[PDB]
Structures are given as C-alpha cells and as structure tokens.
C-alpha cells in the first residue's frame, strides 16, 4: 500500500523563509497520522475543527502542507483569530480552518555562531494580508511623510527583516520549523483515508 510521502516534507534539508512559505500538495495516497502523535520531537501539535483520533477514520480529497520557519514566541500566532506581525503580514489562516499545526525546535540545524541571516520575515505592508496569500514583493515601503524613490533613508524602510538566529539564544528565541496541514474536501473521489 503506497503511503503519503510525509517524509519529503518534514525531513526536507532546507526550509523556506516565512514570507515565501512553500506549499506542497499531497494527494492520492494513504497517511498514518500515528507516526506524528507518537513522536517526541514535535513540541506543538494542535488541531482545529477535528480531533486527532477521528483523523484515521476520515477521508479527504486533498491535503496541503505549508512549511516555514519562525521564532519560538511567534508560534502562538499560527492559529485562527490571532494577531501580530507574522499573522497580519506573512501567513494568515482563515476563520474556519480545519487542520492541524505541527512545530518543533530546530536549533541544531538553523542556527550558527555569529547569526544566520538567511531567514527573513515581512515587517511592513500597506494592508493586512488575505488568508492563504503570499506576496513576495520587495519594494521600498514609505512609512513617513517624505516620498521614497528606492533609496533607503530614515523614513524609507526595506520591508524585510532578518531574524538573526543564534545558538546562545534562549529557548523562547530559538528557531522553530512549522508545518501546517490543511484538510479540504471537494466534490471528487477522496483517495486520502486511514490505513485501516
């Protein structure tokens, strides 16, 4: 019985930044959700609209896997009805989200002495991001009265900000990898079910 390749998502060598969050579509397979529960890496496993036990007994036409990296104290923003810089400007979940949120500490892989600057998050935007939208524009954002023409000044900010992950940083500030599973059920054969 062919299984859903969850390993290609969780054990990916490189994880995309939060602003440019990577989405993989998983379809037409069977997935055993109990390799997830019975693991100790995952510090955060929370579900909305469904119950972990039910997952084995249900079927879904398509499962989406959104993956990215954020700060520890920012994981609380990956939930419906939350606010903050990440939830407002980078990744927003709809109010009726039905799925599970999985996160684990990745300090051994994404930090380096002196700081790892390759991970960025969006810090400025004209309006709040609509749910499941990924704008990756990098134009200069004008925050003050002075008009901006592409030269960063006191009132002309580059919209992206590096995290600067360090190993010395406390657990609250260490990098966490996040994977969001979304369960949509369309009008189509549901070939994602439980293995029983």
């Amino acid at each position: 019985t062919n299984l859903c390749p969850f390993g290609e998502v969780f054990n990916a060598t490189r994880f995309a930044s939060v602003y440019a969050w990577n989405r993989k579509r998983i379809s037409n397979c069977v997935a055993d959700y109990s390799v997830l529960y019975n693991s100790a890496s995952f510090s955060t496993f929370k579900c909305y609209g469904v119950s972990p036990t039910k997952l084995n007994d249900l079927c879904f036409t398509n499962v989406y896997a959104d993956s990215f990296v954020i700060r520890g104290d920012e994981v609380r923003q990956i939930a419906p009805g939350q606010t903050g810089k990440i939830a407002d400007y980078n990744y927003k979940l709809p109010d009726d989200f039905t799925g599970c949120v999985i996160a684990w500490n990745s300090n051994n892989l994404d930090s380096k002495v002196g700081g790892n600057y390759n991970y960025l998050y969006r810090l400025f935007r004209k309006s709040n991001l609509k749910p499941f939208e990924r704008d990756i524009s990098t134009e200069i954002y004008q925050a003050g009265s002075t008009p901006c023409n592409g030269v960063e000044g006191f009132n002309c900010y580059f919209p992206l900000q590096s995290y600067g992950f360090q190993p010395t940083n406390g657990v609250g500030y260490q990098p966490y990898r996040v994977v969001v599973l979304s369960f949509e059920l369309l009008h189509a054969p549901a070939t994602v079910c439980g293995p029983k």
């Epitope: 810089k85 002495v113 002196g114 700081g115 600057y117 390759n118 960025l120 810090l123 400025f124 990098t138 960063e152 900010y157 580059f158 992206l160 900000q161 590096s162 995290y163 600067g164 360090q166 010395t168």
Partner: nanobody, 129 residues
Framework: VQLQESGGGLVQPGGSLRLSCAVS????????IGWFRQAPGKEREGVSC????????KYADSVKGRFTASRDNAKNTFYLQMNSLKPEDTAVYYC???????????????????????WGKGTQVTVSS
C-alpha cells in the same frame, strides 16, 4: 546582552551633550544601533541609526545637522553627540539594538521601531533656563 545609558544631564539652551551606550554580549557579526527619544505626552520616535561598522549614519529631519553618531575604535560603545539643543528636544533617550538584514548579496542597516530586539533603561534630558 546588556545596554547601559549614561550622560543624561541638564544644560542651558545652545549647549552640548554626549550620550553613551555600552554594548555587551552581542556576538552578532552585523547589527545596528539606534537612538530613540520619548517626549512627555507623545509616542516614541527615532532619532538616529548607525551600523556596527559605523559607516552609515541616518538622522531624522528634525535633528539633521545637529546630531552626530559615532563609534569608538577601541571599545564597543556608541555615542550620540547633540549640539545646539533646543527646548523641544527634552525627552528620555533610549539605546536599542537590532540585527542587520542580508538579502541578495547586499546588507541593509535600518532601525524599524517595531523590530528592535533589546532596549536600554533610558535617561532624562531636560534643557531649560
């Protein structure tokens, strides 16, 4: 990491001052140091922002031409020289640090208010006669 503020004083109009900010425990290869101010009755406002190297200095329009930001060559201490002070400049001044942004082979050193990671305790500066 610890941030200490010093040099707060009372001076006559037109006088000068020098604020110091001691930077300790930062192992980051590239960071930025910003000076902010908070006046009575108003929100916090940016005044200055400098690179760790000290090559790039950015000043707000109000303070431009009167404030000079420099870094010592033998210590990790950053200075904000304030000349020709005006009474409206009275406020509590805060030292703050933030990581620099690396993108596509170019570094940016900015001081966005909401992005600062560490703050100092601040000192009051009053300019009266």
């Amino acid at each position: 990491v610890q941030l200490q503020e010093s040099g707060g004083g009372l001076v006559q109009p037109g006088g000068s001052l020098r604020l110091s900010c001691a930077v300790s425990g930062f192992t980051l290869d590239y960071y930025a140091i910003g000076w902010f101010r908070q006046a009575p009755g108003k929100e916090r406002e940016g005044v200055s922002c400098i690179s760790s190297s000290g090559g790039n200095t950015k000043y707000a329009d109000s303070v431009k031409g009167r404030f000079t930001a420099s870094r010592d060559n033998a210590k990790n201490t950053f200075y904000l020289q304030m000349n020709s002070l005006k009474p409206e400049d009275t406020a509590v001044y805060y030292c703050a640090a933030i990581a620099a942004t690396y993108y596509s082979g170019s570094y940016y050193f900015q001081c966005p208010h909401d992005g600062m990671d560490y703050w100092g305790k601040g000192t009051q500066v009053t300019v009266s006669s």
